[PDB]
Design a binder for this molecule. Structure first.
Ligand code: BCL
Ligand code: BCL
Ligand code: BCL
Ligand SMILES: CC[C@H]1c2cc3[nH]c4c(c3C)C(=O)[C@H](C(=O)OC)c4c3nc(cc4[nH]c(cc(n2)[C@@H]1C)c(C(C)=O)c4C)[C@@H](C)[C@@H]3CCC(=O)OC/C=C(\C)CCC[C@@H](C)CCC[C@@H](C)CCCC(C)C
Ligand SMILES: CC[C@H]1c2cc3[nH]c4c(c3C)C(=O)[C@H](C(=O)OC)c4c3nc(cc4[nH]c(cc(n2)[C@@H]1C)c(C(C)=O)c4C)[C@@H](C)[C@@H]3CCC(=O)OC/C=C(\C)CCC[C@H](C)CCC[C@H](C)CCCC(C)C
Ligand SMILES: CC[C@H]1c2cc3[nH]c4c(c3C)C(=O)[C@H](C(=O)OC)c4c3nc(cc4[nH]c(cc(n2)[C@@H]1C)c(C(C)=O)c4C)[C@@H](C)[C@@H]3CCC(=O)OC/C=C(\C)CCC[C@H](C)CCC[C@H](C)CCCC(C)C
Ligand SMILES: COC1=C(OC)C(=O)C(C/C=C(\C)CC/C=C(\C)CC/C=C(\C)CC/C=C(\C)CC/C=C(\C)CC/C=C(\C)CC/C=C(\C)CC/C=C(\C)CC/C=C(\C)CCC=C(C)C)=C(C)C1=O
Ligand SMILES: COC1=C(OC)C(=O)C(C/C=C(\C)CC/C=C(\C)CC/C=C(\C)CC/C=C(\C)CC/C=C(\C)CC/C=C(\C)CC/C=C(\C)CC/C=C(\C)CC/C=C(\C)CCC=C(C)C)=C(C)C1=O
Ligand SMILES: COC(C)(C)C/C=C/C(C)=C/C=C/C(C)=C/C=C/C(C)=C/C=C\C=C(C)\C=C\C=C(C)\C=C\C=C(C)\C=C\CC(C)(C)OC
Ligand SMILES: [Fe+3]
Lengths: 266, 296, 237
């Protein structure tokens, strides 16, 4: 197949100019922008490895400009290189989304995947652009390091006691847990059907729908469960981004003390 | 997206198999709510014996916990609704062994309630095998549900017995389990260096990556009947065809309308599989993961 | 154990990933990719095995990997020279069904639900089937992206199993009826707006053989024609 689809077209920005395929990969204007951005951030990280004397990935880390710098600038080595790498990361993410937007047009397909990806981008920019700007110092953001970001995770979690208690976080988790169940169930359903009990003829959506009514007593649509996947996951990361944008900006306290609101009047 | 027009006709039953117990309710369609997103037909359900056995023991477990919660608030409105989260059904905790049966408020409560939760879940497994067999489907749903059962079984039955004490099990309480999970991190030398928890998080994130991706591609290939997955697997056409060409042209490789579901079952079951493995070790073999890391 | 177990688990993954998963995706997608050397861009391994699907109620055995090619002609002259470029269309891509207009020759049979009967047939032929919420599309003007009316909605064609409006039957001004995918129209209260297509044409939509059933072949041809209009209709963007 493929070949009949490779027709000249689509392309938001970049005219005819960039409409070609490096093998499987469509290029396009935002394709070169993704390349350009990933090259820049890779150079600057390579550079922060050298400036600390390690090339080992368990140890290479890039941390934000410390709290006194505010939302100002910093020296590359005392913060500024996390700042430049962030600009290349946001630039390279937004190009990739708008790369998808262009492949979509050419495939005569729907906009849903870029729209979904924009949510992972929103979560990222919560932690790195919005919650720090809100809180006045770029240093509240996380370090770009395989182990050191989990160090940041545990410290900010624990700065508020047991961060399970953060309500918007509790429900974000609730979607993460439901969405995983929804994936295991959905994939397993179609393969219950396409690959029936050995020498049986393939099953039908009619069989799928009937299986879930016998277990549960309802069966959302086939269309319906793909509407469900998209929503459980984009809610999990929406509520996640909320959870980490209220903490620090409006709740400055040990999260256990929230719930006492309920605990008193009778 | 949402339906624009809803269309109804009579009720459906595409063979609810043996002994045709599966007709409790027959119907109850929800339009304005369930039908704008998904299907409207409520029911029919099957209920045959194991289904009664799960609901009986499930309810029983749930009710047992409830009588002890009321005992914690004595008996009250006000207070009960106030402290619902803060009540608990901690094990024999009183941590003095596996010791077959502790006094009612000291261990009885929990072992008794755990018996019903053990039966409820296992019979419901049984159900998912049977309900599948009968429609000639094959085990997949009760392939997947076993890694869920694995994490459940390691957190309550198998690690407390691998530790020689029921005290190492999870309490039945809202806030209690949020805390048990935190303390288990603390007393196992910061669980983030537990190599399995790192894979579990990679897969739990990976699942919200993959259903978001999958969901979005079928909904984008909706207008060529892409949601008809099972058909496109039997006779492929445009929607299957350019759904995957999107990913080949973006990230470099792709999937078959069948095979992406082969990715997705696993991309979800590896969450409790790896995770379960991870907890089985955390106590039983590795006392402290920070050290474990360091010592290589 | 532990360090033994984590090593073993990373072995397992290497197993899982290619030799079930990506092997089983090679089964069709794109099936030993040749327009030159059939695997070549990177080291694969390998092309999975045959698996046969016996198809339900009626006749069929699908053995995949599929030894198959569509000869049935792709009207595309290649812009060449730096060899990885856009293949241009020789004539009108839309009628030629190429690019965003591409159909696939699927089976020219209707898909029959669980008990051998047409999945989609019109609401005229559906036993007590009628619109239970939302604007009733029947009888509305159908207006294309150039704001001009090209017919009227006459019927809804419904998927019975998963009860849903899949198509609108639109009678074009001259009693010719076209089938149109529900996922491509905007049912408002005063018009039904088809954004993908021009009014003055609409006409070009592939026609059904029976008026009461549509075939998989035909569905793909209709939907493909519609969607291609989004690129190929200059009156809209
Ligand atoms: C350890 C201390 C605290 C705690 C502290 C925190 C803190 C602190 C934070 C969280 C956050 C989260 N916590 Mg917590 N949390 C705790 C315990 C838990 C428990 C548990 C079982 O008890 C659970 C289930 C969770 C669950 C969660 C998630 C709901 C949430 C993660 C959001 C997310 O996925 O971001 C979305 C994902 C992204 C941002 C990724 C974006 C990716 C971008 C777009 C692209 C990358 C491109 C890549 C580089 C390209 C490479 C290309 C190559 C080709 C591959 N926490 C304990 C109590 N938790 C985070 C949150 O709320 O989220 C904002 C957060 O900041
Ligand atoms: C996995 C790590 C911890 C844990 C950490 C957390 C964290 C962290 C959170 C929860 C939350 C919940 N947990 Mg828990 N939880 C554990 C084990 C369990 C077990 C069990 C094995 O039987 C059960 C029944 C529950 C049940 C629950 C729910 C009451 C609640 C929402 C879950 C959900 O989204 O489900 C969806 C399922 C369907 C919709 C079906 N947890 C283990 C011990 N749980 C969330 C909450 O807000 O608590 C009130 C929450 O934030
Ligand atoms: C969501 C809350 C925290 C966070 C908390 C964690 C935690 C907690 C864990 C990770 C882990 C990972 N994180 Mg992180 N991580 C964050 C933001 C990011 C960003 C980013 C650009 O924003 C990136 C690229 C990463 C990347 C990574 C991966 C290197 C690693 C496996 C991820 C995965 O499952 O992806 C899925 C992608 C594919 C399947 C492809 N994280 C935010 C700040 N991250 C895991 C790890 O193994 O680290 C040791 C892990 O346990
Ligand atoms: C990777 C494994 C993932 C997974 C998979 C999974 N779960 C599964 C399956 C699979 C593959 C099933 O086939 C099975 C199922 O039937 O799904 C619908 C199931 C299931 N996973 C469930 C839950 C669940 N799975 C979880 C997680 C996961 N499941 C993982 C994410 C979680 C967590 C902890 O987040 C939960 C809470 C069950 C809903 C369901 C079946 C378990 C079972 O055996 O249930 C029997 C229970 C009873 C008979 C007692 C019921 C008592 C309650 C009705 C009391 C009142 C509750 C209250 C909140 C009010 C009522 C709510 C509404 C009904 C109004
Ligand atoms: C609903 C949101 C969920 C989601 C969705 C999602 N992700 C997506 C999509 C969607 C819909 C895509 O279309 C896109 C894709 O193409 O998938 C293959 C993608 C994608 N999601 C990815 C990852 C990812 N998504 C995540 C999460 C989520 N993605 C949510 C769960 C996470 C985590 C940790 O949870 C990760 C790691 C990528 C595999 C992929 C493509 C992203 C992309 O932009 O790729 C371009 C690649 C580059 C530009 C090279 C990077 C160069 C940079 C300069 C490096 C910068 C370093 C960085 C700032 C810090 C690194 C530090 C960490 C190690 C701590
Ligand atoms: C502060 C505590 C630290 C912590 C602890 C922790 N995490 C844990 C555990 C613990 C102790 C686990 O046991 C669990 C795990 O498996 O460990 C690897 C897990 C885990 N931590 C996770 C994530 C996670 N932890 C994080 C952090 C941390 N985890 C902290 C460092 C983070 C962060 C900060 O980013 C993330 C994203 C998951 C990967 C994993 C949990 C995997 C999961 O989603 O599975 C849930 C599924 C179950 C619990 C199985 C239940 C199945 C039964 C069959 C259901 C029976 C249902 C019942 C009958 C009721 C039904 C009701 C209905 C009918 C309505
Ligand atoms: C393409 O495949 C697929 C379908 O087909 C078209 C489907 O329908 C569905 C949809 C089916 C579902 C069951 C929804 C999936 C989403 C979930 C969050 C899981 C189910 C949630 C529950 C709360 C399950 C119910 C739990 C129990 C214990 C049974 C209750 C017992 C009764 C007697 C019910 C009566 C009610 C009172 C999926 C997932 C699917 O993937
Ligand atoms: C049903 O439908 C569906 C399909 O179809 C049938 C599908 O296939 C898929 C997707 C298929 C899968 C098998 C799921 C994949 C599994 C995952 C866990 C998610 C992806 C995870 C990864 C680790 C993939 C790696 C990620 C990326 C982003 C690869 C990118 C790699 C690069 C090297 C970047 C290259 C980028 C560009 C722009 C190159 C430009 C090149 C130049 C030379 C420019 C200079 C100009 C000259 C889904 C979801 C689906 O639901
Ligand atoms: C009476 O009041 C009314 C009627 C109002 C009822 C109301 C009930 C209310 C208000 C609340 C109930 C709350 C509950 C049930 C909350 C539970 C929440 C969570 C977070 C529970 C999670 C715990 C997970 C566990 C412990 C998982 C493991 C269980 C195991 C594996 C069980 C097996 C254990 C043993 C003892 C089996 C021995 C078996 C043999 C065979 C021998
Ligand atoms: Fe699917």
């Amino acid at each position: 197949f493929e070949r009949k689809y490779r027709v000249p077209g689509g392309t938001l920005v970049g005219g005819n100019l960039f409409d070609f395929w490096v093998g499987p990969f469509y290029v396009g204007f935002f394709g070169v922008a993704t390349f350009f951005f990933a090259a820049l951030g890779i150079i600057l990280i390579a550079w922060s490895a050298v400036l600390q004397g390690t090339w080992n990935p368990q140890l290479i880390s890039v941390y934000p400009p410390a709290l006194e710098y505010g939302l100002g600038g910093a020296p590359l080595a005392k913060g500024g290189l996390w700042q430049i790498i962030t600009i290349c990361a946001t630039g390279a993410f937004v190009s990739w989304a708008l790369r998808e937007v262009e492949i979509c047009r050419k495939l005569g397909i729907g906009y849903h995947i870029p729209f979904a990806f924009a949510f992972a981008i929103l979560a990222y920019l919560t932690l790195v652009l919005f919650r720090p700007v809100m809180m006045g110092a770029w240093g509240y953001a996380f370090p770009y390091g395989i182990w050191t970001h989990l160090d940041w995770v545990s410290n900010t979690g624990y700065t508020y006691g047991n961060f399970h208690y953060n309500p918007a976080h509790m429900i974000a988790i609730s979607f993460f847990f439901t969405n995983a169940l929804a994936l295991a169930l959905h994939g397993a359903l179609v393969l219950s059907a396409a690959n029936p009990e050995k020498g049986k003829e393939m099953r039908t959506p009619d069989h799928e729908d009937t299986f879930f009514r016998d277990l549960v007593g309802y069966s959302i649509g086939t269309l319906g469960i793909h509407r469900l996947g998209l929503l459980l996951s984009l809610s999990a990361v929406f509520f996640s981004a909320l959870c980490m944008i209220i903490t620090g900006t409006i709740w400055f306290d040990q999260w256990v003390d929230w719930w006492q609101w309920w605990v008193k009047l009778p | 997206i949402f339906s624009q027009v809803q269309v109804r006709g009579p009720a459906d039953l595409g063979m609810t198999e043996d002994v045709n117990l599966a007709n409790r309710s027959g119907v109850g369609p929800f339009s304005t709510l369930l039908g704008w997103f998904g299907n409207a037909q409520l029911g029919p359900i099957y209920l045959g014996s194991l289904g009664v056995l799960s609901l009986f023991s499930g309810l029983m477990w749930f009710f047992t916990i409830g009588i002890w919660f009321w005992y914690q608030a004595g008996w009250n409105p006000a207070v009960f609704l106030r402290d619902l989260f803060f009540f608990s059904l901690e094990p024999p905790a009183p941590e003095y062994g596996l010791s077959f049966a502790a006094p009612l408020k000291e261990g009885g409560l929990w072992l008794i309630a755990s018996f019903f939760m053990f039966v409820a879940v296992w019979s419901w497994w049984g159900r998912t095998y049977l309900r599948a067999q009968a429609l000639g489907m094959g085990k997949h749903t009760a392939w997947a549900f076993l890694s869920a059962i694995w994490l459940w079984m390691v957190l309550g039955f198998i690690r407390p017995i691998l530790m020689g004490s029921w005290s190492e099990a999870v309490p039945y309480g809202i806030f209690s389990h949020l805390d048990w999970t935190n303390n288990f991190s603390l007393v196992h030398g910061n669980l983030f260096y537990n190599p399995f928890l790192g894979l579990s998080i990679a897969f739990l994130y990976g699942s919200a990556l993959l259903f978001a991706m999958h969901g979005a591609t079928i909904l984008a290939v909706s207008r060529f009947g892409g949601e008809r997955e099972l058909e496109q697997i039997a006779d492929r056409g445009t929607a299957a065809e350019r759904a995957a060409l999107f990913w080949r042209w973006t990230m470099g490789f792709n999937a078959t309308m069948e095979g992406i579901h082969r990715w997705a079952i696993w991309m979800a079951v590896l969450v409790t599989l790896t995770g379960g493995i991870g907890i089985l070790l955390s106590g039983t073999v590795v006392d402290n993961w920070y050290v474990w890391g360091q010592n290589h | 154990l532990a360090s033994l177990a984590i090593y073993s688990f990373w072995i397992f993954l290497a197993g899982l990933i290619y030799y079930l998963q990506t092997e089983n995706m090679r089964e069709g997608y794109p099936l030993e990719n040749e327009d030159g050397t059939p695997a070549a861009n990177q080291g694969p391994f390998p092309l999975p095995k045959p698996k046969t699907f016996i198809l339900p109620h009626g006749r069929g055995t699908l053995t995949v990997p599929g030894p198959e090619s569509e000869d049935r002609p792709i009207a595309l002259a290649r812009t060449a020279v730096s060899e990885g470029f856009p293949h241009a269309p020789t004539g009108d891509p839309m009628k030629d069904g190429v690019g965003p207009a591409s159909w696939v020759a699927r089976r020219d049979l209707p898909e029959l639900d669980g008990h051998g009967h047409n999945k989609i047939k019109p609401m005229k032929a559906a036993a007590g089937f009628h619109v239970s919420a939302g604007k009733n599309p029947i009888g509305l003007p159908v207006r294309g992206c150039d704001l001009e009316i090209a017919g009227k909605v006459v019927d809804i064609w419904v998927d019975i199993p998963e009860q849903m409006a899949r198509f609108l039957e639109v009678e074009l001004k001259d009693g010719s009826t076209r089938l149109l995918p529900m996922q491509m129209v905007k049912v408002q209260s005063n018009r039904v707006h088809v954004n993908a297509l021009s009014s003055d044409l609409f006409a070009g939509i592939p026609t059904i053989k029976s008026p009461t059933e549509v075939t998989l072949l035909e569905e793909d041809k209709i939907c493909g024609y519609v969607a291609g209009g989004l690129m190929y209709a200059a009156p809209k963007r």
